[PDB]
Amino acid sequence: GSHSMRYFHTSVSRPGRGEPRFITVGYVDDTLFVRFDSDAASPREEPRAPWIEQEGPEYADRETQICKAKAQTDREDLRTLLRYYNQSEAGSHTLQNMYGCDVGPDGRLLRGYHQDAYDGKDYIALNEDLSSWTAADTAAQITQRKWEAARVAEQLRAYLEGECVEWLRRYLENGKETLQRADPPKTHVTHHPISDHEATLRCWALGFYPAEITLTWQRDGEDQTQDTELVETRPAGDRTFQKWAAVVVPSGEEQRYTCHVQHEGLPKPLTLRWEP
């Protein structure tokens, strides 16, 4: 299928409580494979998937050095944004960055990303062309002008179309047992009376990977989008994900409702009903 590689980074300042904490994680699809936390006893990028340890200690040291250098750039950038936004040195602020690439089933680049946010709001993003920028405001326009002068987009384009794509293909092969296996959802429908005139039907999907799934309820073959309560897909802690969708139904009308489940791991889609 299609795949992604992403690196996520968060720096959070804490004036009067030391230097900003820096946490970065890497993912291939919904699998965490590396982590670094500046508050660890001996900060290093640590593996979180068995297929990355085989890369060797030179790989781990190069990654750890990049993590330490990004923590330092982020600390400098947090100081710069206090100036650009005319903010005091008293409050806690947040810097987030994500970058990475998406590839198709054939491993060809579908698109690249590089984007930053300050205090939870867009700051500056590399456009899908990998050649121009979208700055959210006049502070981010200062960074845009600096990055245009230094031809930063060209450097990012080279990385995103080159190493990002190649190393994602490499990890997909080395971790094929897990990264290229879709685990279908285990499903069931539960029934819970609410009053003597209504009951809840809840459609469950458990144990699936990747997280992408479509769970819907239909009544007489019509989608019940407005009336369906749909919880966010949630991690189980063993690589898999869970989700449920519920509808309030009039007593005696249960047979008219069908739950529909679409997921990559299934031989093909499921149509479920409350059984007893």
Partner: peptide, 9 residues
């Protein structure tokens, strides 16, 4: 593999 490039705001 992370990008080794360093850019400042």
């Amino acid at each position: 593999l992370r990008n080794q490039s360093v850019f400042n705001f």
